[PDB]
Design a protein around this ligand. Structure first.
Ligand SMILES: [Mg+2]
Lengths: 55, 104, 75, 145, 57, 143, 189, 144, 68
RNA sequence: CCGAUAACGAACGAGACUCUGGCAUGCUAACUAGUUACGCGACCCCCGAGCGGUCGGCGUCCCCCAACUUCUUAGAGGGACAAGUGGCGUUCAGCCACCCGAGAUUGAGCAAUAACAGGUCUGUGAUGCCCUUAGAUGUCCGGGGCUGCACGCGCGCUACACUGACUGGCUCAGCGUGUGCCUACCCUACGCCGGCAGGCGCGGGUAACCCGUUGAACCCCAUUCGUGAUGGGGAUCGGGGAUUGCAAUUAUUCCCCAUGAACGAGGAAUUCCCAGUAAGUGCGGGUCAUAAGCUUGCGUUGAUUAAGUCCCUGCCCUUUGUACACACCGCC
């Protein structure tokens, strides 16, 4: 409808408040260190970010 | 002026962090500054465990991602003025440097 | 072997049995006297501490779960 | 002294509508009364001023009726209001602690009220199902087959 | 202080920034012989190097 | 041959000081001591009626070990395992007001003072009394 | 000499059989004040042999779920029980234990894979190390089973288990399961 | 009569349990964390604390004061570090203040009875893996 | 068990022995140090494993005709 | 890997490699870690010590106004290689025991060619094809649902107790984490109120600076219980009170008073495992406005049997037969 009810329902928390910054998905989010990255996109940029595998 | 300056360095590779430590304190040693030793702060290990598969089928295998953060503190406390003598930074990529007066 | 239903408190026929033959054998615990005189076991702890104040029975261990006593030297 | 069993001994008593064993501790004997729990028992013996280690079978009859009447009027014997059962009553609002068959029929009164108003818990209780909203998928099968 | 962020969040944010930068550089400069990005960032100002085989385009 | 409370068994000492407080009943023993549980993780109230003298004796001995503790620091020390029923066991602290009213009554005895910072520590008067019972419980240990 | 638990000097005890003379470890070389040691005895074969047998009984006394790591409760009940047997017999508790070990060690057994007559097929005699290992377990289990639904405790249950094994009265579960084994081994020769 | 600066500080660690002894020339006295050697939580295991001192005789301890401190570990692993620290501190005093022949007559008794009094236990832990609930334990795999 | 030496460790060890026979003896720790300046071995673990094979080969070449 | 050798020279994998734990009183450092010494106090002493003892009570980078790295932290390095002795072995390749040694097998990560019609188009502004596209299979809003139960299956937690439960006292960890671009929501010291769940102010920490000396659980020492479906057990259910959120009914969660169910060691079958293992046992992280019975990690306590075999189940090399080649779940 009009601007008053097109986005009426609040989204201050929950999965609806936070989405992935890369693939724009609300599942598998890694909020540790405020990554806000998709569970698979995190591995995609793992080398670029600097997370190495040691053990 | 009379000043005391605390310098802290933080990077991801210890080799270039020990190099940026070495050359800065070495120049002060020639410039007659009283340099406290490099304070090796405990290394912050940023570990994240993430499921390898994107779909959830398999033998339930994970992935352990380590990220090492090393901090070293160097104190440049000579009784005389220090700020004008040290103007260069001569820093390298991968490190973050910091200047702070001992007041705060 | 359906229930033990031991007397919670003594009567005349077991009060004298405790005080005439129990301080006669070396191996005495609240457990052993329970299977001999058919007593409860909480009462046995009360009776044993009575006999320690009466002074006819020596102490050996005194632990919170395994408290043991003994007879004095004979002869 | 581990003395002999008291002569005036009730092997099993009879308090209100139930019986308590006289061969055990008095505090854990009155817990056999429906509505009377352990925490209730170990606060009414302190407020009635009695020995604790005494067995249930050596309570004198005036001590017996004292503990009963202490629990019979818990509102006026320094017992805190957050310790009763039917506190903030639906029926009359007053704060009560019932320890008899009246507890059983006040559970009946609450249950029949839910049936009357046909709430969700009333209907769930009618069918015999769980009412606390837990999963019914794989449990509760012992009472079925 | 509260003005800044912790070292844990700061380095992660920089890694996020590098990953965002490289992906955009690859996407915008796909046909331009682009290879990779190395950033030599100083607190005074940020400075970025784009590695490519052909610079006239 | 001096005697310090740290030089003997603490368990024998803490019972000695609780009875010492029992005879000198000037301590503020509140009106609900016969009612409450000492902790959230405890299902049964303690058997001893003078558990208040027990807790006061316990915390004073602790304050000599280290000062600056607050109400939260006490309830952390006095915390214990919670069975939690069907769920796996957790850890829970004690009762906050129980520690708070014990601590308040201690200044009623004038043996502990609030610090310049948060928490409280011993007065030399309280330090005198803690070691005062330490001497006699050490003498009773030898003889 | 070592005064285990403050008393019961280890220099007086003996092993009556030479198959076990070098496979029991209460000697003066293995004389320890306390039966508790994180000595890493079991990291190698033929190395638990030099582990003190009192230590081995202590380790083997904790079983069945709730008691697998709890060792302080075990050492204390071992201490309570050893005074109990010393009281009930008048002599060295290690001598009570050593007689229990020898008399409860199953001298032979039987083990096969194929179709069997009753339980096993062929009789194979055990090693002296197996003799000590099985005797320790059988004594521990007899105490463990005797203290499950009775008012008696672990120390006294272990006491009668060791005593009935040491003398021999077919009341010890350590010898009763031993003879039940010897019957099957002899019959399946 | 007032000889200054005759002291050593010797540690011992096992299963992360750290004990640091402050050995000094003084009266025969043993204290850990300001507490008597006898007054300690594991009275059942106190004979392990008495095990070093008994095996050497208080003659060697009369002219030595020991001040141990513990900053971690468990309960019984704490003791096994403590007893090692005490004996190693004593033989370190005897190493650099008297002849090491005195160290030999006291080292051989330590090494013959238990090498843990001189060489600490090196086994620490093993990390848990994502296959199951433990370092080696795996979950209950099921086929139907 | 499981300490047999791979091709890499054996091949370099044979070569350096027959090139610097005059500069090599039978002490292991001396042997592990000579190989540092006559061969650039990136691994400290690899260099003293070679020297372990060097001591064995020197112990046999002093008595019999090794293939080196 | 040694050896012969129609082979010769090689490639990858294994090995090697990184990280992790193990000794380093060797070096370098350390007021965002401390230890000793000294000087103040406070107490117990005193018959009297007086360098008696304790203090995580105060101090000596509150820059002239102590020394040092033993404890802590992390860099540079060393150190282990079957180095030495005996034996076995072609006396080679290599194997076994042992002295000395911190360690004589610490665990992970990586992981060859080739393949599966194995899983993912519900991760992606990765995508082909097909479908829909305005009464939308797009998007928004409200409500319901994913919870629903005669039943079977699988992963798990809690018990059946006395090697225990309850009550009080004593007394210890290491991981690791904390205030937001979007995006609102941190971790909490202390003081007061409430019995508890909680509430109200005074701060601190963007962190070896505060939580936090992370006073965890287990256990240690004493009390009650006393072999009963019991003070085991807490299932089911009633009443009441609090926080989070617009929203708590189908009960988010927690607390308090109540009922106290089955269950008294579990059939056929079957999982995991060789030393800091299993197991007991709590604590971090993730999921999170609200949160763990899960999961990923950490810590406390710490055993038994075994140093072997191809018997049941499979695997690798060689030989062999095949009517198999979708390859024995074959063929016929
Ligand atoms: Mg009751």
């Amino acid at each position: 409808g009009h601007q008053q009810l097109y986005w009426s329902h609040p989204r201050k928390f929950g999965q609806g408040s936070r989405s992935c910054r890369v693939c724009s998905n609300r599942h598998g989010l890694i909020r540790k260190y405020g990554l806000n990255m998709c569970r698979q996109c995190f591995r995609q940029y793992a080398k670029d970010i600097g997370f190495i595998k040691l053990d | 002026a009379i000043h005391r300056i605390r310098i802290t360095l933080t990077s991801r590779n210890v080799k270039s962090l020990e190099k940026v430590c070495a050359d800065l304190i070495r120049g002060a040693k020639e410039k007659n500054l009283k340099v406290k030793g490099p304070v090796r702060m405990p290394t912050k290990t940023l570990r994240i465990t993430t499921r390898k598969t994107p779909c959830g089928e398999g033998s339930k295998t994970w992935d352990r991602f380590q990220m090492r953060i090393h901090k070293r503190l160097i104190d440049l406390h000579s009784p005389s003025e220090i700020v004008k003598q040290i103007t260069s930074i001569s820093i390298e990529p991968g490190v973050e440097v910091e200047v702070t007066i001992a007041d705060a | 072997r359906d229930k033990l239903n031991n007397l919670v408190l003594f009567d005349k026929a077991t009060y004298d049995k405790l005080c005439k033959e129990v301080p006669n054998y070396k191996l005495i615990t609240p457990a052993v006297v329970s299977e001999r005189l058919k007593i409860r076991g909480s009462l046995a702890r009360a009776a044993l501490q009575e006999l320690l104040s009466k002074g006819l029975i020596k102490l050996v261990s005194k632990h919170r779960a395994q408290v043991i006593y003994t007879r004095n030297t004979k002869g | 002294m581990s003395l002999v069993i008291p002569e005036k001994f009730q092997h099993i008593l009879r308090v209100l509508n139930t019986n308590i064993d006289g061969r055990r501790k008095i505090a854990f004997a009155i817990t056999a009364i429906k509505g009377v729990g352990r925490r209730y028992a170990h606060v009414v013996l302190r407020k009635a001023d009695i020995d604790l280690t005494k067995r249930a079978g050596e309570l004198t009859e005036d001590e017996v009726e004292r503990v009963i009447t202490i629990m019979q009027n818990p509102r006026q014997y320094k017992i805190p209001d957050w310790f009763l059962n039917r506190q903030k009553d639906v029926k009359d609002g007053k704060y009560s602690q019932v320890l008899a068959n009246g507890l059983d029929n006040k559970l009946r009164e609450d249950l029949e009220r839910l049936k009357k108003i046909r709430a969700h818990r009333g209907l769930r209780h009618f069918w015999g199902l769980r009412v606390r909203g837990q999963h019914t998928k794989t449990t509760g099968r012992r009472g079925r087959t | 202080m509260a003005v800044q962020i912790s070292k844990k969040r700061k380095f992660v944010a920089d890694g996020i920034f590098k990953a965002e930068l490289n992906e955009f550089l690859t996407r915008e400069l796909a046909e331009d012989g682009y290879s990779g990005v190395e950033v030599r960032v100083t607190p005074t100002r940020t400075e970025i190097i784009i590695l490519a085989t052909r610079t006239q385009n | 041959p001096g005697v310090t409370v740290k030089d003997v068994n603490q368990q024998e000492f803490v019972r000695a000081l609780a009875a010492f407080l029992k005879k000198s009943g000037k301590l503020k023993v509140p009106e609900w001591v016969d009612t409450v549980k000492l902790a959230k993780h405890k299902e049964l109230a303690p058997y001893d009626e003078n558990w208040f003298y027990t807790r006061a004796a316990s915390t004073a001995r602790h304050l000599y070990l280290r000062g600056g503790a607050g109400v939260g620091s006490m309830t952390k020390i006095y915390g214990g395992r919670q069975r939690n029923g069907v769920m796996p066991s957790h850890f829970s602290r004690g009762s906050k007001s129980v520690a708070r009213r014990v601590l308040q009554a201690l200044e009623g005895l004038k043996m502990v003072e609030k610090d310049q910072d948060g928490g409280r520590k011993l007065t030399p008067q309280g330090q005198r009394d803690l070691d005062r019972i330490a001497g006699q419980v050490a003498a009773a240990n030898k003889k | 000499d070592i005064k285990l638990f403050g008393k019961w000097s280890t220099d007086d005890v003996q092993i009556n059989d030479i198959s076990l003379q070098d496979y029991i470890a209460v000697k003066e070389k293995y004389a320890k004040y306390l039966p508790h040691s994180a000595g890493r005895y079991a990291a190698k074969r033929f190395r638990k042999a030099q582990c003190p047998i009192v230590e081995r009984l202590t380790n083997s006394m904790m079983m069945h779920g709730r008691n697998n790591g709890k060792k302080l409760m075990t050492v204390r009940i071992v201490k309570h029980a050893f005074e109990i047997i010393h009281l009930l017999t008048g002599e060295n508790p290690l001598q009570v234990l050593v007689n229990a070990i020898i008399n409860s060690g199953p001298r032979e057994d039987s083990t096969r894979i194929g179709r069997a007559g009753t339980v096993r097929r062929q009789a194979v005699d055990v090693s002296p190390l197996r003799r000590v290992n099985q005797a320790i377990w059988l004594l521990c289990t007899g105490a463990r089973e005797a203290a499950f639904r009775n008012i008696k405790t672990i120390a006294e249950c272990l006491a009668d288990e060791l005593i009935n094994a040491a003398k021999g009265s077919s009341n010890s579960y350590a010898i009763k399961k031993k003879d039940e084994l010897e019957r099957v081994a002899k019959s399946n020769r | 009569s007032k000889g200054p600066l005759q002291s050593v500080q010797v540690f011992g660690r096992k299963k992360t349990a750290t004990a640091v002894a402050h050995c000094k020339r003084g009266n025969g006295l043993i204290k850990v964390n300001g507490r008597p050697l006898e007054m300690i939580e594991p009275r059942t295991l106190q004979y392990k604390l008495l095990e070093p001192v008994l095996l050497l005789g208080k003659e060697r301890f009369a002219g030595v004061d020991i001040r141990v401190r513990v900053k971690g570990g468990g309960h019984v692993a704490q003791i096994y570090a403590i007893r090692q620290s005490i004996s190693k501190a004593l033989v370190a005093y005897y190493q650099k203040y008297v002849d090491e022949a005195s160290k030999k007559e006291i080292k051989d008794i330590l090494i013959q009875y238990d090498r843990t009094l001189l060489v600490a236990d090196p086994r620490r832990c093993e990390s848990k893996k994502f296959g199951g609930p433990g370092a080696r334990a795996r979950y209950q795999k099921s086929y139907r | 068990m499981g300490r047999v030496r791979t091709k890499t460790v054996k091949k370099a060890a044979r070569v350096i022995i027959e090139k610097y026979y005059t500069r090599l003896g039978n002490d292991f720790h001396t042997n592990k140090r000579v190989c540092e300046e006559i061969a650039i071995i990136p691994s400290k673990k690899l260099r003293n494993k070679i020297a372990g094979y060097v001591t064995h080969l020197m112990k046999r070449i002093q008595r019999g005709p090794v293939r080196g």
